[PDB]
Design an enzyme around this catalytic site. Structure first.
Site, mmCIF file in Angstrom:
data_model
loop_
_atom_site.group_PDB
_atom_site.id
_atom_site.type_symbol
_atom_site.label_atom_id
_atom_site.label_comp_id
_atom_site.label_asym_id
_atom_site.label_seq_id
_atom_site.Cartn_x
_atom_site.Cartn_y
_atom_site.Cartn_z
ATOM 1 C CG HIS A 1 -14.788 18.326 16.137
ATOM 2 N ND1 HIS A 1 -13.878 19.088 16.840
ATOM 3 C CD2 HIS A 1 -15.088 19.034 15.022
ATOM 4 C CE1 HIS A 1 -13.640 20.207 16.181
ATOM 5 N NE2 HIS A 1 -14.362 20.200 15.075
ATOM 6 C CE1 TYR B 1 -16.184 20.225 11.280
ATOM 7 C CE2 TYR B 1 -13.819 20.674 11.178
ATOM 8 C CZ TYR B 1 -15.052 20.846 11.796
ATOM 9 O OH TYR B 1 -15.153 21.645 12.916
ATOM 10 C CD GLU C 1 -21.642 33.419 37.842
ATOM 11 O OE1 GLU C 1 -22.742 32.925 38.179
ATOM 12 O OE2 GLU C 1 -21.103 34.372 38.451
ATOM 13 C CD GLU D 1 -10.194 17.850 14.718
ATOM 14 O OE1 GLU D 1 -8.986 18.101 14.469
ATOM 15 O OE2 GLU D 1 -10.551 17.130 15.679
ATOM 16 C CE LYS E 1 -21.199 12.206 32.299
ATOM 17 N NZ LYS E 1 -21.016 11.950 30.841
ATOM 18 C CD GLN F 1 -11.186 28.409 31.682
ATOM 19 O OE1 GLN F 1 -10.185 27.968 32.235
ATOM 20 N NE2 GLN F 1 -11.988 29.296 32.254
ATOM 21 C CB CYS G 1 -10.388 30.255 22.139
ATOM 22 S SG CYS G 1 -9.505 28.783 22.772
ATOM 23 C CD1 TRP H 1 -14.926 16.677 25.990
ATOM 24 C CD2 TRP H 1 -13.657 14.832 26.000
ATOM 25 N NE1 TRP H 1 -13.950 16.835 25.036
ATOM 26 C CE2 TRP H 1 -13.157 15.718 25.019
ATOM 27 C CE3 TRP H 1 -13.015 13.602 26.192
ATOM 28 C CZ2 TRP H 1 -12.043 15.415 24.229
ATOM 29 C CZ3 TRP H 1 -11.904 13.297 25.407
ATOM 30 C CH2 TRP H 1 -11.429 14.204 24.435
ATOM 31 N NE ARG I 1 -4.956 21.462 10.557
ATOM 32 C CZ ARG I 1 -5.179 22.156 11.667
ATOM 33 N NH1 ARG I 1 -6.169 23.033 11.732
ATOM 34 N NH2 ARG I 1 -4.377 21.988 12.707
#
Ligand SMILES: CCCCC[C@@H](C/C=C/C(=O)SCCNC(=O)CCNC(O)C(=O)C(C)(C)COP(=O)(O)OP(=O)(O)OC[C@H]1O[C@@H]([n+]2c[nH]c3c(N)ncnc32)[C@H](O)[C@@H]1OP(=O)(O)O)SCC=O
Ligand SMILES: Cc1cc2nc3c(=O)[nH]c(=O)nc-3n(C[C@H](O)[C@H](O)[C@H](O)COP(=O)(O)OP(=O)(O)OC[C@H]3O[C@@H](n4cnc5c(N)ncnc54)[C@H](O)[C@@H]3O)c2cc1C
Ligand SMILES: NC(=O)c1ccc[n+]([C@@H]2O[C@H](COP(=O)([O-])OP(=O)(O)OC[C@H]3O[C@@H](n4cnc5c(N)ncnc54)[C@H](OP(=O)(O)O)[C@@H]3O)[C@@H](O)[C@H]2O)c1
Ligand SMILES: Cc1cc2nc3c(=O)[nH]c(=O)nc-3n(C[C@H](O)[C@H](O)[C@H](O)COP(=O)(O)O)c2cc1C
Ligand code: SF4
Ligand SMILES: [Cl-]
Ligand SMILES: [Cl-]
Ligand SMILES: [Cl-]
EC number: 1.3.1.34
Length: 671
Positions: free
Chosen positions: A252, A166, A654, A164, A566, A339, A341, A577, A214
């Site tokens: 990420h 890291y 919201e 990922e 934006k 959303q 998590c 995104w 991993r």
């Protein structure tokens, strides 16, 4: 009926009851007041329901590796009772659990972050400190220390996180590693760190300890690794002493979606399958595996030896026991919305689940029999009503769920029709089945009045929302269509469209109206083709040379909003995104700081950058928000009846599905 899924796996010195691993998930409880006790009960329930092996959320080996200041860390025998409380809760239930050792490298949101080289991340405000030779040796000893402690705490093993993007992952790629040192240069030096970490861990804990590595098999970033490197490292890690190799997809920073809903089910099984035969160690595949059949098919086809599922375990702790008893239709499927998590732990909050508000909060939200039974009435079968209804009926209350539509679901019946959100169909199938199971008396096609039917002890209004009709001059003009007219009533929409109102619905409407054809959310090869993923993995980071291939939008669409920020800024932190990139690649335009003059035969007259413009559009779609619908709110209070308001009819600002469900669920568990 899932033979492959439930087949034991022999690891030489121990056996896993089945081929399912509960993927690593940093919940945020790790560095919380009574986290130990809450995580203990969180995990115990998954172990009680079949998970063969659980991998804890990532935990730092030292101080420079934490995720955020004060982040989870295991570097002192003092922290052992904490973990001991966890491993023992899992063992009592007959499960196993390994601790993930994660050092966030240049990704930690902390000033003292360290990396292989002084290269700032595109998504981090801090500049990392280029580690020194002796510091790296110490880090390597720190990983061993971490594992020693984990073993002392009673863990069945540890997972060394090398993906990922890291720390460990960063040493491997020339995108982040520019050292001339012995830890840089050719690939053999770049692997040194990962191999040395696993080798130091193995020596420290002995042979009878599960070590998972991993491995990043698809970086998805420029200058990432090649498949040849992936293979050499895998074999290197095997010889270093790993017990199992798990799959890691993306970084990420990667501008390609790896876990969100638009990502097809089992979208990356093919990647893990490519490593088969190159190592003898059991291989675990991961990402978007949220169905027993999908997982079983992946296993029976030989794509991997095990499947990892993280989020599905937040969505339903009983995922496997239900599968094994023929109740897959009762599984509360993870819809990959991110959303409750990922979006939450990213802002430093405790993770939860949109379809399961009790996720990571089971101890603080007990389900007691029933204070004392009652005959309830729920108006509206949307997620708010549904959540309350089945939760109250499972408590003993008698529930009568009314809804004016021909089927339960509320707005979810519109959402599920948005390309890349078909997973919503699963949630409705789940609630539909749970209604039968908990005994809820369902009455569809019933438009309820404050008078018609009200002989109930209490009433719970879960009515919906009323779309907002902006007071713009000529808002009734023929060109004007609400989002309901377009999405629900399939109203004809011309070639040129102007969308008023960005944010949630506005983005989904644009996704829908710009859909080039069939969604790649259900076509693995298509998804890979559209996002520029190289199936051979021969290209650096598995990126095809020809880059992205998102089709052109069949229509000319321009999205508009008055705020100057934006467009799409207010969307989910980890998903906005994606949609924004998709829409922009399809040719849709998004314009902020807009003032709406009027709507006439010439189109939409607006003001942009201080200058008027006429948008010769064939249609103007209204996605200008919602307002609560409380039609029965007062007629019930002006009738001396106890009434409750949940979901949209209480707050519309919201108020998305998460608040709706958590609210209905909270009422249901209290009442
Ligand atoms: C991702 C949230 C953190 C979860 C941490 C937890 C562990 C999670 C492990 C996982 O594997 S999660 C699954 C895989 N990862 C994902 O799905 C995350 C993908 N990334 C994202 O969702 C986001 O980028 C996220 C990191 C959440 C937020 O980023 P952000 O701070 O809002 O910035 P943003 O809105 O994403 O903007 C980034 C800006 O910089 C540019 N950018 C970024 N990367 C690149 C690149 N490779 N090349 C060129 N440009 C790039 C963009 O053009 C953009 O410009 P702008 O004009 O918008 O400013 S806990 C760890 C404890 O140690
Ligand atoms: C295209 C689209 C995409 C969306 N995407 C997302 C997403 O990705 N994530 C997220 O969290 N949220 C999303 N939402 C919002 C989500 O769909 C939730 O439904 C909403 O936040 C709350 O639902 P609710 O239960 O309060 O009410 P609703 O879902 O609106 O349901 C109210 C119900 O009660 C009934 N009703 C109303 N008045 C009466 C009456 N007098 N008698 C009987 N029945 C009545 C109706 O039949 C209706 O089904 C989306 C919405 C749309 C339109
Ligand atoms: N799962 C996800 O990823 C996700 C993402 C976002 C939202 N959601 C949720 O899903 C739902 C979608 O809501 P929504 O988009 O329809 O409403 P909304 O975004 O919550 O709010 C209304 C939007 O329309 C515009 N607007 C408001 N009044 C207006 C007016 N009088 N004239 C013109 N434009 C106006 C606003 O932008 P301007 O004022 O700048 O013009 C604003 O962005 C919400 O409940 C939300 O919480 C989910
Ligand atoms: C809230 C959350 C936290 C996560 N934390 C970690 C973590 O600490 N370490 C890690 O290696 N992966 C982490 N992941 C990624 C998962 O391990 C897994 O790779 C991914 O979510 C797989 O997709 P699935 O949920 O569809 O199975 C996290 C995911 C979520 C949603
Ligand atoms: S929040 Fe959406 S992504 Fe997360 S676990 Fe629940 S259902 Fe799946
Ligand atoms: Cl330290
Ligand atoms: Cl909380
Ligand atoms: Cl209908």
């Amino acid at each position: 009926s899932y033979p492959s899924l439930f087949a034991p796996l022999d690891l030489g010195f121990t056996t896993l009851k089945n081929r399912v691993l509960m993927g690593s998930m940093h919940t945020g409880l790790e560095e919380y007041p009574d986290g130990a006790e809450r995580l203990a009960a969180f995990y115990a329930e998954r172990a009680r329901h079949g998970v063969a092996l659980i991998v804890s959320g990532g935990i730092a080996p030292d101080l420079t590796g934490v995720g955020m200041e004060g982040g989870a860390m295991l570097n002192d025998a003092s922290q052992i009772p904490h973990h001991r409380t966890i491993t023992e809760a899992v063992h009592q239930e007959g499960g196993k659990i390994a601790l993930q050792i994660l050092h966030t490298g240049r990704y930690s949101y902390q000033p003292h972050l360290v990396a292989p080289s002084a290269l700032q991340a595109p998504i981090n405000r801090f500049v990392p400190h280029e580690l020194s030779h002796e510091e790296i040796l110490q880090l390597i000893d720190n990983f061993a220390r971490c594992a020693q402690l984990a073993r002392e705490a009673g863990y069945d093993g540890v997972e060394v996180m090398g993906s990922e993007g890291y720390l460990i992952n960063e040493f491997l790629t020339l995108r982040t590693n520019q050292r001339s040192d012995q830890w840089g240069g050719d690939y053999r030096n770049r692997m040194r760190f990962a191999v040395e970490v696993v080798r130091a861990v193995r020596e420290r804990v002995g042979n009878d300890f599960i070590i998972i590595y991993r491995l990043s098999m698809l970086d998805l970033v420029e200058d990432g690794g090649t498949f040849a490197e992936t293979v050499e490292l895998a074999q290197a890690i095997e010889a270093a002493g790993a017990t199992i190799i798990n799959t890691g997809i993306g970084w990420h920073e990667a501008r390609i979606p790896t876990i969100a809903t638009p990502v097809p089910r089992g979208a990356f099984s093919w990647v893990t399958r490519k490593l088969k035969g190159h190592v003898s160690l059991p291989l675990v595949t991961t990402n978007r595996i949220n169905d027993p059949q999908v997982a079983d098919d992946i296993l029976s086809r030989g794509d991997a030896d095990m499947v990892s599922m993280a989020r599905p375990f937040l969505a339903d702790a009983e995922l496997l026991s239900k599968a094994q008893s023929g109740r897959a239709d009762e599984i509360n499927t993870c819809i990959g919305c991110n959303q409750a998590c990922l979006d939450q732990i990213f802002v430093g909050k405790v993770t939860s689940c949109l379809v399961n508000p009790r996720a990571c909060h089971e101890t603080k939200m007990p389900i007691l029999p029933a204070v004392q039974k009652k005959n309830l009435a729920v108006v509206g079968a949307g997620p708010a009503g549904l959540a309350f209804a089945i939760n109250a009926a499972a408590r003993g209350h008698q529930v009568t769920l009314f809804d004016a539509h021909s089927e339960i679901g509320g707005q979810f019946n519109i959402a599920k029709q948005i390309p890349g959100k078909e997973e919503f169909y699963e949630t409705l199938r789940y609630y539909r089945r749970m209604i039968e199971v908990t005994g809820v008396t369902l009455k569809l096609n019933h438009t309820v009045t404050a008078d018609q039917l009200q002989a109930f002890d209490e009433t719970i209004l879960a009515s919906g929302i009323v779309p907002r009709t902006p007071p713009i001059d000529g808002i009734d003009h023929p060109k004007v269509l609400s989002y309901l007219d377009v999405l629900r009533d399939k109203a004809p929409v011309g070639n040129k469209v102007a969308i008023i109102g960005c944010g949630g619905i506005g983005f989904d409407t644009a996704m829908y109206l710009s859909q080039p054809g069939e969604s790649t959310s259900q076509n693995i090869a298509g998804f890979c083709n559209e996002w520029g993923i190289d199936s051979s993995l021969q290209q650096a980071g598995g990126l095809s040379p020809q880059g992205m291939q998102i089709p052109r939008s069949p229509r000319q669409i321009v999205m508009l909003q008055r705020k100057a920020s934006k467009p799409g800024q207010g969307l989910g932190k980890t998903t906005g995104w994606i949609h924004r990139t998709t829409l922009l690649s399809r040719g849709v335009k998004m314009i902020p700081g807009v003032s709406y003059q009027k709507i006439d035969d010439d189109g939409l007259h607006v003001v942009i950058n201080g200058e008027t413009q006429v948008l010769a559009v064939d249609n103007v779609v209204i996605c200008a928000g919602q307002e609560p619908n409380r039609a029965l709110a007062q007629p019930l209070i002006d009738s001396g009846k106890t009434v409750h308001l949940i979901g949209g009819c209480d707050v519309a600002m919201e108020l998305d599905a998460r608040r709706a469900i958590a609210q209905g669920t909270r009422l249901a568990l209290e009442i």
